[PDB]
Design a protein around this nucleic acid. Structure first.
Lengths: 208, 150, 84, 129, 190, 82
RNA sequence: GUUGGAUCUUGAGGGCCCGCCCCUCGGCGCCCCCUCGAUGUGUCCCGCGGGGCCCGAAGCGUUUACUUUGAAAAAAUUAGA
């Protein structure tokens, strides 16, 4: 677990969640995400349970920890909103970064113009990062992924409930992940939160 | 499985676990037996008696007050209908279809339907004959079906 | 289902929404109730799915009206099962 | 409707097990089903079961394990005089080192190893391994 | 009048003498006059339980039981006070037609219904122990070990009356049949 | 796979699972475990000593795996906010 | 013609195994006879030997199929000493 009071959440997180529009979900009924759901908003739309979002995020974070090299976890986003997000994560945690197009075959193909060696994949939506998700299960790689109520759950080990499409939702979850892994093993230390704001993540946000 | 109807659905109630219903006022044996005797005097079938007892009185079935059911009471008394209620109502439908068939000799549907109902009577009746609820020396007929319903 | 659940004491909202004979412990949810209703001056016991009307001496006719589902009732009424 | 009850139960478990599902509702529930489940349970092929009681005919919830590979039914039942047991055992089991043929004998529903010791035959119900 | 409460050909005394004297007291006692004045129990038997109080099991031939069950809780409460903590209840024992075997004697039979058989009698005893709640359902859990425990669901309305009783009901059943019973409250009403 | 009283036949002893109680065979794809780090608690900061769960081809292709991991992890502990 | 739902009870000895539970015999006993010890056509220990009647036991209660053990079951052949 860790030192323990702020790993049972705190108001600071609950404010960030609400702001980033995490809480709203899809309108498709569930059979694999159903457990996670707190309550259903009137006339469709599911309110995800922040308590569940926490525990899964921490279990994910913990799995990246106990590797003494953070490079062999590949952070993956093909979404525009999360290109900046993963780039900041890679600076911070020390992940090997994949922003924009994946380009098929880097965990496959003996003869190729690039090859990456991971041990764990972190995905932002496995219906946009579907190519890594399929490719990973041909070569025996576990995949964590940020899943909503209409994402595929096949070949995903650990799902993290969250909207995880667009806006600040993808950004915030990368920020909180980086903060979490640095707590256990980093230089934030002692299981207390980051001094970096989530705004360094998020999207580019069109510059005036 | 149904070979006696073209259905697919259900046609019975769910029934409760317990041998006592409703347990807040189950009345007494006395009350409902009197009521049964008086209703059965009027020539009412066990079905009809069960319905009216259920809703108006605080009994549901009378199987939960005493181990007897409405038929059992009737049968032991010796005041009872002279054939089972289901068999009666089957015979009654086949009469009604037969009357409609007399009226209309172009109604192919009615001919088909009559056959089905008649077959249904025979299989039920065969069951009653074997277990001595009907005499084996009676048999269903156009002739006698009329006489029963009248 | 997520296809590995085992339920030995199932919640009474996923067993109470189902059809009457499809329940995981089968007893129907039907009950009796006492009806007070003001033009009747006696407390008539009525069946929730009565089918045919319940009537009483105290009322002219005002007690039930037939409906294929739950029996219709008129003015002030109460219900307590009691104990099914 | 149901002209064998063993055959439905056995399939139900196997189909659950394929999914990874750890529950089934078998019914109509009979004395023979209970007996078959207990012998099966003892050897570790399935987990524990719980019989729910109704006035319909009963329903059993079996919590199963994936220590089973196949529970087959020999329907229609055949006589076994302890010199067709050998023929069955080579035919329909993968080795003689493991698996049980489960029969009903007059000395009780028992596995065929116990049958061999008693030298009491009867009717073959099924098998598992 | 008690005149049949102690006679049963039992060697004791102690408890039966106590219970018979108690019965006379109750016969005169208010709101229980004119219903024990013609109905006097065949025997009383004492068997202990794990509550550290003894349990008094009274035998009724079935017609008596209806009157005893009517009151139950109030009567049992008075008898518990009188006998200093003993838990009193009422159990019905029928004759029970012989085994469907064959050898070991199968005696005289004529049709044996499933409402007078050994299992039926045990179910009837369970029903008789309770009064303000009924048995909604039952389940038996078969353990992996091979043991069985029967969880008897009771009504979730008026439960309180049976809650304190539970331990004695468990123990008494164990002494009589050699099987443990436990009580539970379901998930029906609500 | 033993022979006799405990003689070793066999080329190797394969991994098992506890999310469906089915062996991971023989060179199969989509078969990997999942080392979650322990944290020592109270003072924070990761201390060893991996908790490992074994995930088979079967569960993953039937899209079970997400829920399964939580059941396995919770049952033997330990994660904050349980 | 084939097939068919649920539902009825049997503690010790030794480190499982055994009998049990929710009259033609043997014999717990009762009565008889040559009587066996109180006795030597004959008792009051008992039916022990022949009896009757009648319990644990047992036809017991209503039948089986099945399965199980026996017999009856050509020699040569055939497996096989």
């Amino acid at each position: 677990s860790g030192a323990l009071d702020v790993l049972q959440m705190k108001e600071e997180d609950v404010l960030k969640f609400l702001a980033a529009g995490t809480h709203l979900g899809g309108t498709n009924l569930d059979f694999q995400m159903e457990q996670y759901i707190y309550k259903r908003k009137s006339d469709g739309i599911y309110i995800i349970n922040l308590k569940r979002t926490w525990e899964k995020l921490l279990l994910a974070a913990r799995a990246i920890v106990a590797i003494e090299n953070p490079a062999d976890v590949s952070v993956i986003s093909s979404r525009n909103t999360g290109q900046r997000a993963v780039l900041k994560f890679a600076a911070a945690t020390g992940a090997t970064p994949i922003a924009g197009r994946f380009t098929p075959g880097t965990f496959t193909n003996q003869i190729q113009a690039a090859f990456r060696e991971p041990r764990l994949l972190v995905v932002t939506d496995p219906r946009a990062d579907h190519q890594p998700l399929t490719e990973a299960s041909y070569v025996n790689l576990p995949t964590i992924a940020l899943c909503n109520t209409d994402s595929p759950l096949r070949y995903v080990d650990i799902a993290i409930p969250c909207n995880n499409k667009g806006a600040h939702s993808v950004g915030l979850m990368w920020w909180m992940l980086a903060r979490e892994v640095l707590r256990m093993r980093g230089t934030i230390s002692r299981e207390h939160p980051w001094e970096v704001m989530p705004d360094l993540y998020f999207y580019r946000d069109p510059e005036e | 499985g149904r070979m006696h109807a073209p259905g697919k659905g259900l046609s019975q109630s769910a029934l409760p676990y317990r041998r006592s219903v409703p347990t807040w006022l189950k009345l007494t044996s006395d009350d409902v037996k009197e009521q049964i005797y008086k209703l059965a005097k009027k020539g009412l079938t066990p079905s009809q008696i069960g319905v009216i007892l259920r809703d108006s009185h605080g009994v549901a079935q009378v199987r939960f007050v005493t181990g007897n059911k409405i038929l059992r009471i009737l049968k032991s008394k010796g005041l009872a209908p002279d054939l089972p209620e289901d068999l009666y109502h089957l015979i009654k439908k086949a009469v009604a279809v037969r009357k409609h068939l007399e009226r209309n000799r172009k109604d192919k549907d009615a001919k088909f339907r009559l056959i089905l109902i008649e077959s249904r009577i025979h299989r039920l009746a065969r069951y009653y004959k074997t277990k001595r609820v009907l005499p084996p020396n009676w048999k269903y007929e156009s002739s006698t079906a009329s006489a029963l319903v009248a | 289902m997520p296809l590995a659940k085992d339920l030995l004491h199932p919640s009474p909202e996923e067993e109470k929404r189902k059809h009457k004979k499809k329940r995981l412990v089968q007893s129907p949810n039907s009950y009796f109730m006492d009806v007070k209703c003001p033009g009747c001056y006696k407390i008539t016991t009525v069946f929730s799915h009565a089918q045919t009307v319940v009537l009483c001496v105290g009322c002219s006719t005002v007690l039930c009206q037939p409906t294929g589902g739950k029996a219709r009732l008129t003015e002030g009424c109460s219900f307590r099962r009691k104990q099914h | 409707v149901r002209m064998n009850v063993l055959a439905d139960a056995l399939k139900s478990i196997n189909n659950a097990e394929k999914r990874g599902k750890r529950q089934v509702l078998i019914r109509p529930c009979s004395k023979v089903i209970v007996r078959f489940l207990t012998v099966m349970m003892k050897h570790g092929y399935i987990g524990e079961f719980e019989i729910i009681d109704d006035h319909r005919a009963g329903k059993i919830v079996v919590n199963l394990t994936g220590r089973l590979n196949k529970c087959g039914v020999i329907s229609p039942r055949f006589d076994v005089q302890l010199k067709d047991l050998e023929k069955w055992q080579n035919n329909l089991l993968p080795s003689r080192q493991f698996g049980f043929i489960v029969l009903t004998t007059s000395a009780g529903i028992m596995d065929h190893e116990e049958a061999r010791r008693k030298h009491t035959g009867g009717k073959i119900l099924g098998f598992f391994f | 009048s008690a005149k049949i409460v102690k006679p049963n050909g039992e060697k004791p005394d102690e408890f039966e003498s106590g219970i018979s004297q108690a019965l006379l007291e109750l016969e005169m006692n208010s709101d229980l006059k004119a219903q024990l004045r013609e109905l006097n129990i065949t025997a009383a038997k004492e068997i202990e339980v794990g509550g550290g109080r003894k349990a008094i099991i009274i035998f009724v031939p079935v017609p008596q039981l209806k009157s005893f069950q009517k009151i139950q809780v109030r009567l049992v409460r008075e008898l518990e006070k009188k006998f200093s903590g003993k838990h009193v209840v009422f159990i019905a024992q029928r004759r029970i037609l012989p085994k469907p075997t064959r050898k070991s004697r199968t005696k005289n039979k004529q049709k044996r219904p499933r409402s007078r058989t050994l299992t039926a009698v045990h179910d009837a005893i369970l029903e008789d122990l309770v009064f303000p709640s009924e048995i909604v359902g039952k389940r038996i859990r078969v353990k992996l070990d091979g043991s069985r425990l029967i969880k008897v669901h009771l009504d979730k309305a008026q439960q309180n009356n049976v809650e304190h009783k539970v331990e004695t009901f468990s123990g008494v059943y164990k002494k009589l049949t050699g099987k443990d019973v436990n009580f539970e409250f379901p998930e029906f009403q609500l | 796979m033993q022979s006799n009283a405990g003689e070793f036949v066999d080329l190797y002893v394969p991994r098992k699972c506890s999310a469906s109680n089915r062996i991971i065979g023989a060179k199969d794809h989509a078969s990997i475990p999942m080392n979650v780090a322990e944290v020592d608690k109270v003072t924070g900061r990761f201390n060893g000593q991996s908790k490992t769960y074994a995930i088979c081809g079967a569960i993953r292709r039937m899209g079970e795996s997400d829920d399964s991991i939580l059941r396995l992890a919770k049952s033997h502990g330990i994660v904050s906010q349980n």
